[PDB]
Amino acid sequence: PEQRALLYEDALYTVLHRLGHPEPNHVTEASELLRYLQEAFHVEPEEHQQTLQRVRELEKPIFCLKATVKQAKGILGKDVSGFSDPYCLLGIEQEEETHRTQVITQTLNPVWDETFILEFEDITNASFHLDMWDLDTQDDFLGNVVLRLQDLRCREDQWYPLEPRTETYPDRGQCHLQFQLIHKRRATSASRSQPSYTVHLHLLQQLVSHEVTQHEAGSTSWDGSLSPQAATVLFLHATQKDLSDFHQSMAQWLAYSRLYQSLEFPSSCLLHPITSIEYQWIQGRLKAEQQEELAASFSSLLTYGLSLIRRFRSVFPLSVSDSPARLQSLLRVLVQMCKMKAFGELCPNTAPLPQLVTEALQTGTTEWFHLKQQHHQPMVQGIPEAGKALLGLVQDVIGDLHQCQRTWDKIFHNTLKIHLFSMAFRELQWLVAKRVQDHTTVVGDVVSPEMGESLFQLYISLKELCQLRMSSSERDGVLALDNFHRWFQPAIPSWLQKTYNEALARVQRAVQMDELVPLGELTKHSTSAVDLSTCFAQISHTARQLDWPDPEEAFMITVKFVEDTCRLALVYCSLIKARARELSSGQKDQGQAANMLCVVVNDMEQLRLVIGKLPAQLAWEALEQRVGAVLEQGQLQNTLHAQLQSALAGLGHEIRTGVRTLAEQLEVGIAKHIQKLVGVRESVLPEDAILPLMKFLEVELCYMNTNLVQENFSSLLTLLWTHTLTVLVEAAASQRSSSLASNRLKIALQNLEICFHAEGCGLPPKALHTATFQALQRDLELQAASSRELIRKYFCSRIQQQAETTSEELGAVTVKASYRASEQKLRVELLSASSLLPLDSNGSSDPFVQLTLEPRHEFPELAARETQKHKKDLHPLFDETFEFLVPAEPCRKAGACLLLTVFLPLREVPGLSGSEEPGEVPQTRLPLTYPAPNGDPILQLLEGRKGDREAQVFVRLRRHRAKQASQHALRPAP
């Protein structure tokens, strides 16, 4: 207003009367301060010249000196001892200008601290005059202080020395003084129509306003305390009206606070004045006026700052890169303001700082939530619009609580110990619960799929909001967002549909977008398998994302997801079978269809792995620990495990039918190769007939291992092994009477065992045997391959049975046998035969012994030895020694025996069974096992070979001796 002019004039009347040489902190030059004041006041120089003319015409104030003289010490003692009380004569030469302070006894110096003005006219022409005269209780003279006033300024306390007047005493002491200079009652109307203190406050307000508007175009980073020339022009009109620093300090505080409430400057510049009220308040007093103004400005700055920290989401947002610093500075001038005695003057506010700060935080959070709700489009009625509004609102509240957790939490807790996050999260879970609960109430019990998805996003956002609780020291008792999952109970059947309708979507497109080709040459499946892995992982991820804390319903959802996954398994199986059918209607290649069935069954195997991973993916182990309490035994294995096992069995079907198809093809090949192998002539060696079957089996199974997973290949190997064992067993009976193809089949079984074992395309059947394998190999090894081998096997079995025979009724012949390793001669001593039977039906025993080495073809060139004949002897005495010329090589061979036609071991004879040469011939007694009419299965297989005559002679004489021994056989009593 008009005061901006009149205050301006007062500035001139206080600045062209500036007298004295410049201070270390004050400057004496009119032109620079005048041009700076014109620049700050935005006043054009013609008005400046007009005001200078109007201030020259005002009469000049009569200048005076505020002579503040203090005590004097250091004066040498030439007076009476003690009672030294000199008096000071203040005067200025260029009552009226002289004064004599009264003297006080029993003092080194009088201490009174009073000041009387001394009117003068000129500063550069006048000298200071002050003399001491120490009266004695002679009045001895002391020194004086004489200095030119040009170096005399305001704020000039110093210790000045008294100049000696006579040279008889060199020292006069040092006296403390305080030099000021003030004006008298001045003539301006600006400072006399209004009180000097309020025009000082207004003038200082003018400088601080123009300083903060001239330091920058705006005001946000003004750093100084004041401009230097502005500080000087402040320093005059602060001490030239008899004014101390006390009213200047309160005026500085009032101007700075009202300026801050007018326009923003950084409040660290408020830190310099506020501590001044901390420093100087107790020693001084104020009247009933301006003390209430001090209290009102305290209350107004407090209210402005509290309205600032109530709205700290707007005035200090985290986008201007110094919001926590500026906020901390605002609280740091809010503390150190309540931290003096001067806050005892606040009648509008007595309740303390942390409680009212929390009150402002509470109101600001509530109002911010309300304005955010109005921001998030509530003006359109409807349920999906309100749903998306709530989703945006809870996302914004998640953001606000996140930025209240990292940044704004510590700066509220370190200074005044206020937990922002706990109270903010309590309030903004209550105000959000009361919105989502009503939204889900007006949802009803019917839920649309898009509406269900909206509630699902709201569910996970609110679950994040409740997750933020556990990082805030367990907010309990104020629970209003706990059990928020209850309100989403009507939305559960939609989600478990939609998730399924998501998952069934993917597996519908996965088979649609895939031609079922092998995924590279390092793994064996297609993209449908990895899509299964991702889709079932998505199902399990949805199940984990839900994480229903209620037990029985969580069990119910887990059963729902298990049936969804099993149903998707069956669905996917039907789609790949249909896709294989669709492709087989496209092409007609045998190899393409074969490898298509292959990649289908590796996809099924991959799905089996995924289904096996489902108890780990859906976490049934963590389920059964909480749903095993109120449920029944076996129910967990029935509802969860049993349908999974049925899904695995339904995978086994068309795993064990896709494998079974290839197994049927390969078993047809193996069986036809075996049937064409037995059809070859018997005059060929058994090493070139195996080649076609062997190369076919090798190349087909050894292409097919690279095309199939090892587990399905192991199943295919086991089925093929079982089938070829069955084929070889049924082909082991359709053989000719000579049975010389039995060695071909033995070579076949050996190579088929060794081709199922070769690594890379054969898996070792050495731990998994079946009774068919050993039965076939033993039965056909006894079938193969010559007549002499069968005779040797019969003799080995017969001597094993004879060693197992201990009955003495059939006859016991006592012989001695010695084999020599140095003379080559076998020595046999036959003594006697005991406990015999008659060799004639009349009752006459005929013990006569043919000591033969048998089998006869094993000893082709030797003359057998014989004993003397005996008639009717139950204990005949032979006691004959006979030598036999036979080397040890045929004797150590299997089946070699010494037969006594009336056996005994020949490879186990003493002297050849691992012992030394017998110096004394041991006993050997064996009971005679007569040939039996009930023969072993070996004889009818000798009788198939009729070309040779020796084997036929053997079997005919064996039958004759068997029927003859049956006549002499004594039937046992029942």
Binding site: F555, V559, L631
Partner: protein, 184 residues
Amino acid sequence: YDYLIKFLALGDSGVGKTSVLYQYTDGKFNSKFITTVGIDFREKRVVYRASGPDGATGRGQRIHLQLWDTAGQERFRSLTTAFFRDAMGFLLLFDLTNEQSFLNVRNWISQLQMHAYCENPDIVLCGNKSDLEDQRVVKEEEAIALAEKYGIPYFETSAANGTNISQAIEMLLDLIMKRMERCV
């Protein structure tokens, strides 16, 4: 198997669908049962193709029956509607001992027709506990009236003796077969 059918023995509490599925799966019966918590899951590998090729016994087609014993408590009725999504055939069981199970049959059908798998739900209404004649407060005429009004077949099976449960489930499986031969 050759077909896989998902029965839901669904009804009220105290009706005893657990005993019905127990007496269909085997011959064992319990005097007292606890209320079903969550849902159960019975399995049966019959070979019927609807019912046996000699009329009631023989080799038809292998039917793997899942027989879900759903809960009758109201706490597991809302979420159980997710299992109605592919639920071929429903076993409405009520008890002739109490009439509240009878009046809740209409509400049960009204809930089922909005959650049916195919174009129309399959229902066989079984008035269980028909051997205990001391507390029978449900007449045959009213039951056959509700059957003919809603078009659903009806039976008077019981689990304490095991009679007629098998025939009821067999003809319901037959009804599902007529519906599949109707759907294609």
